[PDB]
Amino acid sequence: MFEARLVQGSILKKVLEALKDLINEACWDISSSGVNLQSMDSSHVSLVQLTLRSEGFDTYRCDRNLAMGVNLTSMSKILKCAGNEDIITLRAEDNADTLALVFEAPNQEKVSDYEMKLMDLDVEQLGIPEQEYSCVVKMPSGEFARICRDLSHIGDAVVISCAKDGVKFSASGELGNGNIKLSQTKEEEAVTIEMNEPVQLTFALRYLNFFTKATPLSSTVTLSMSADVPLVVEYKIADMGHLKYYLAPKIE
Amino acid sequence: MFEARLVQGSILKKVLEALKDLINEACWDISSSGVNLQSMDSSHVSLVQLTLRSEGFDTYRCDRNLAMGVNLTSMSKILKCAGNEDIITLRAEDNADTLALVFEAPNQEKVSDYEMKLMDLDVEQLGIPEQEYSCVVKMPSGEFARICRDLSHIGDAVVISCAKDGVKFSASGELGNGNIKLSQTSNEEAVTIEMNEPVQLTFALRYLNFFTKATPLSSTVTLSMSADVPLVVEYKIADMGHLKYYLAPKIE
Amino acid sequence: MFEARLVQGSILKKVLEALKDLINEACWDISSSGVNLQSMDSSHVSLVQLTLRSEGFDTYRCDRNLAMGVNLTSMSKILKCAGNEDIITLRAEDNADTLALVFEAPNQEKVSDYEMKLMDLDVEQLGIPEQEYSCVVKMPSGEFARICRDLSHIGDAVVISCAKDGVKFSASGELGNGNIKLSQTSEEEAVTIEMNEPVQLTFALRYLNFFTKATPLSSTVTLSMSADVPLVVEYKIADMGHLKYYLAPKI
């Protein structure tokens, strides 16, 4: 028997917008520690990894560990029925085939109350080795979104060169080519770099533009890179957990 | 001869948005009492009933009773050419085959001036057998819109249960099911109920979502229900008249 | 070796929105006087004429006269990557097949830097002479846009009657017909007329609605007309140049 109550419902809405189009089906690993999700996209290229620790919920109770299989598109449709200021409460009986959801308003005259059909999923757990990275760029989520969205019009791949001065996003294609140079810095939204070794890597823009759907979760985004290992795009669900997107660099 | 002058042109624009897609053709009953319209939708399920009393117009003159047949899509297109703050004046001669429209600006340096071709129409006026109703829910137009719009994603029909405490909108379907519980209030935008007998009725959501296009006419909406009789969704065109939608409940 | 630097980048963004759909390909005539463009639309009905004088650029250098052929849709896509407050610098190194563009942000955190492939085009640019016109209507760009956009729902053509009192836009079609009467005024957004002779002319609304994509360049628009000659819709790129659209009246 499971019962997590989250006051910032917006978090839960924003998460499923960032995921519904990248992954159709996924397995929610519920624990006393918190709510986890780990999955690869439809086409087995990018890896998603959600962590919502139990400290971050206003109430939390989890007697048995659940492994709820969910259609993320279906779950997104239900969370559309929640206002952004609503207090969302997840609940699941022990002997269960469904997840309940209860949206309370700010006024609390209104009380929405949904029940979602679950499903069977035999997806396999994956290894996320704890790797230290050469370059670690911290920048604003919106600027990373803007950049990835813009270079899409130029080309199908972005080349992220990274030095000590700043970071450089490049792209080539039919109509021409482009270079977006961002230097280090400042207050709130600032570009900062922890750089062991210089890195240059190529990534499909198609997939980065899926990751940037998480942009509403965080003012900042962190990109972590080393050669011959997957890029980690991390959006911090502040004071609560994270949403990490992993992506394999191209070989060319 | 006919000449109604309405200062709040917006009213007339908002009306035809609420109707153009639900009914293609309709007969405008002009009278000394005011402008009326009564019609069933394309597919003979829902009944629409507009009343704009002559007290509510800033000028009003109607010598003979007219029965002007109108393509509501055509009339909508002309009212798009009116600004929201424009002063709209309807005018028609004796042996009429056309409706005039006159848009005066609030800057007063522009004067649009349209003429709309009318048409022949056969209208069998159903006796709307004015009833007293079991439940009469008054709530905010926007919340009714939100609710109907949301539950569409869950299912094809809404079940409006109504008690003394509040009102409960339910829906079932493929992905799961949902319940939106709205309670009454003490003390602008408030849920209030006049409840003779408890009522539970099912309605197609498809049609309620058509009715909610009238939402711009009024901050509040009133739902009136009794068993085995049609639901009345009433949007008040304040200090002027109303726009009522009738709908047949489903049969269990 | 061309190098124009424009502080109001927005100008350059707004221009290419007003052009990309009307003309696919066009030839940019660069000169010491400034940047010019002259072209007819895809379907050889309307004539476009851009002038950006070199006084209006914050830096300007042009050693040789260039004739850069450009895919305006491609160039539009690059200018989307510029913010509205960005400082846009055009540059071309004459032993060249490409024009570079560099957008710096006002704060200068960021410096985007693009390079666009050019193309070969048959510079078949036959000019039209500086006519004096019967009616010259000056009105707000937004109202002209509104009017053209609205009457489209009524009909496929607008009849611009013009008198001393004001100006009258008419249209007929299936559902009915309409008349928008705008009178003159006695100072920001005002309708004013220089009227030698009275004029009535018909124009395809389809094309005027393409012209009104220039509306973001200017608070006002000027319509110039005489019988049996093309209508000039002029959007002033203030303190800098203009963007003129020419259109043949119906018969």
From Swiss-Prot, chain B:
Belongs to the PCNA family. Changing residue 246 to A: Complete loss of interaction with UHRF2. It is linked to Ataxia-telangiectasia-like disorder 2: A neurodegenerative disorder due to defects in DNA excision repair. ATLD2 is characterized by developmental delay, ataxia, sensorineural hearing loss, short stature, cutaneous and ocular telangiectasia, and photosensitivity. The modification N6-acetyllysine is found at residues 14, 77, 80, 244. Changing residue 164 to R: Abolishes ubiquitination. No effect on interaction with SHPRH. Gene3D superfamilies: 3.70.10.10. InterPro entries: DNA_clamp_sf, Pr_cel_nuc_antig, Pr_cel_nuc_antig_C, Pr_cel_nuc_antig_CS, Pr_cel_nuc_antig_N. Residues 61-80 bind DNA. Residues 7-100 are annotated as: Interaction with NUDT15. This is Proliferating cell nuclear antigen. There is a cross-link at residues 164, 250 (Glycyl lysine isopeptide (Lys-Gly) (interchain with G-Cter in SUMO2)). Disulfide bonds join 135-162. Keywords: Acetylation, Deafness, Disease variant, Disulfide bond, DNA damage, DNA repair, DNA replication, DNA-binding, Dwarfism, Host-virus interaction, Isopeptide bond, Methylation, Neurodegeneration, Nucleus, Phosphoprotein, Ubl conjugation. Phosphorylated. Phosphorylation at Tyr-207 by EGFR stabilizes chromatin-associated PCNA. The modification Phosphotyrosine is found at residue 207. There is a cross-link at residue 164 (Glycyl lysine isopeptide (Lys-Gly) (interchain with G-Cter in ubiquitin)). It is found in: Nucleus. NCBIfam families: pcna. Pfam families: PCNA_C, PCNA_N. Antibodies against PCNA are present in sera from patients with systemic lupus erythematosus. One of its GO terms (molecular function) is histone acetyltransferase binding. Auxiliary protein of DNA polymerase delta and epsilon, is involved in the control of eukaryotic DNA replication by increasing the polymerase's processibility during elongation of the leading strand. Induces a robust stimulatory effect on the 3'-5' exonuclease and 3'-phosphodiesterase, but not apurinic-apyrimidinic (AP) endonuclease, APEX2 activities. Has to be loaded onto DNA in order to be able to stimulate APEX2. Homotrimer. Interacts with p300/EP300; the interaction occurs on chromatin in UV-irradiated damaged cells. Interacts with CREBBP (via transactivation domain and C-terminus); the interaction occurs on chromatin in UV-irradiated damaged cells. Directly interacts with POLD1, POLD3 and POLD4 subunits of the DNA polymerase delta complex, POLD3 being the major interacting partner; the interaction with POLD3 is inhibited by CDKN1A/p21(CIP1). Forms a complex with activator 1 heteropentamer in the presence of ATP. Interacts with EXO1, POLH, POLK, DNMT1, ERCC5, FEN1, CDC6 and POLDIP2. It comes from the Eukaryota. GO terms for biological process: base-excision repair, gap-filling; cellular response to hydrogen peroxide; cellular response to UV; cellular response to xenobiotic stimulus; chromatin organization; epithelial cell differentiation; estrous cycle; heart development.
Curated annotation (Swiss-Prot), chain C:
Changing residue 224 to I: In ATLD2; a hypomorphic mutation affecting DNA repair in response to UV; results in significantly decreased interaction with FEN1, LIG1 and ERCC5. Changing residue 207 to F: Alters chromatin-associated PCNA stability and its function in DNA replication and repair. The modification Phosphotyrosine is found at residue 207. Phosphorylated. Phosphorylation at Tyr-207 by EGFR stabilizes chromatin-associated PCNA. Residues 7-100 are annotated as: Interaction with NUDT15. There is a cross-link at residues 164, 250 (Glycyl lysine isopeptide (Lys-Gly) (interchain with G-Cter in SUMO2)). The keyword Ubl conjugation applies. Antibodies against PCNA are present in sera from patients with systemic lupus erythematosus. This is Proliferating cell nuclear antigen. It comes from Homo sapiens (Human). The lineage of its organism: Eukaryota, Metazoa, Chordata, Craniata, Vertebrata.
